[PDB]
């Protein structure tokens, strides 16, 4: 009885779903648009990468791609694609992202130019602002900081701005994952870094000869990503 009734309800649910999400196709600019052009997503899975091809891009499947590297390059990508790849635009972007995240370990700490010009906090609290009340609701000691910062600082060399600027925007956002080599997702490159560090420290104690280098495995993984798109 339950089988019959369950199928009766599931058929209708699926018909409704299919009748609303049917016109959503990936476009030549990698954006998921509806029939009238309305942008639903700016990247299919939030990174592209249709499902069936992302099965071996998980970690724990790299020791397989590394073991079968010669077959994978000969059978699919080949030496032709590996050397017809130019990764500079995307590689520099990830270097910038890494430097930023190196200077800002806590990424929820309210970065700001003026906020960065609160290190004199002790300089002000010591003796300067000891005499006032809440003039316009702010403080007696906040007004001294406002005065020192506002126009008593350099014209164009008051660059507390650079110490407090946004993280570069993700690479897939700026560098067109399809036609741009090495432009991958921020969660894939982390996995690749972790695996390269845990794989260069296995070759050292391997009693087998490995003719693959960390920087050929990296290009292999980057091509296998760019092609699962």
């Amino acid at each position: 009885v339950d089988t019959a009734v369950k199928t009766s309800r599931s058929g209708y649910l699926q018909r409704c779903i299919i009748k609303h999400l049917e016109g959503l196709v990936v476009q030549y600019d990698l954006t998921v648009r509806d029939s009238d052009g309305s942008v639903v997503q700016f990247l299919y899975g939030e990174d592209g990468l249709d499902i069936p091809k992302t099965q071996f891009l998980q970690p724990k499947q790299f020791p397989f791609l590394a073991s079968n590297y010669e077959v994978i390059m000969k059978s699919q990508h080949l030496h032709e694609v590996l050397s017809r790849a130019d990764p500079k635009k995307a590689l520099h972007h990830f270097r910038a992202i890494k430097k930023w995240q190196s200077k800002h370990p806590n990424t929820l700490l309210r970065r700001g130019a003026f906020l960065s010009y609160s290190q004199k906090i002790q300089e002000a609290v010591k003796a300067l602002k000891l005499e006032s009340e809440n003039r316009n609701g702010r403080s007696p000691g906040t007004q001294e900081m406002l005065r020192m910062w506002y126009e008593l600082d350099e014209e164009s060399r008051r660059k507390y701005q650079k110490k407090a600027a946004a993280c570069p925007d993700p690479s897939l956002s700026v560098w067109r994952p399809d036609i741009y080599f090495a432009s991958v997702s921020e969660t894939f490159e982390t996995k690749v870094d972790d695996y390269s560090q845990e794989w260069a420290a296995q070759t050292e104690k391997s009693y087998e000869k490995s003719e693959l280098s960390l920087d050929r495995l990296r290009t292999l993984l980057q091509l296998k990503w760019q092609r699962s798109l």
């Binding site: 409704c16 779903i17 009748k19 609303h20 998921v32 997503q41 299919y44 899975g45 939030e46």
Partner: protein, 114 residues
Amino acid sequence: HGAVIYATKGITRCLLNETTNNKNEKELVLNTEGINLPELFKYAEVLDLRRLYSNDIHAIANTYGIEAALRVIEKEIKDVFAVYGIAVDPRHLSLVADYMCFEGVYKPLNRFGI
């Protein structure tokens, strides 16, 4: 019978399910069987109001916005499929939630949505 001394609007009962984690077993959760988001904002020192979750998706969409209701929709579909061992890929629920919440509101996927 329908005369109640006093109650928080929308909440019918609370309960502290002592343990919810093994990794950091020390976690405690104050589950509820009603829904009133603002009537918990007064306890930001007793309870963690970041990490607040509800299955309503219309109440989340009214206290936190639509980009926060997208993820509640996705997590709800995932937890519905999880009770049977089924596991749909996140790339599908992402598209379904992005389409449902396209035009600023949680719109039903039915005859009035067309």
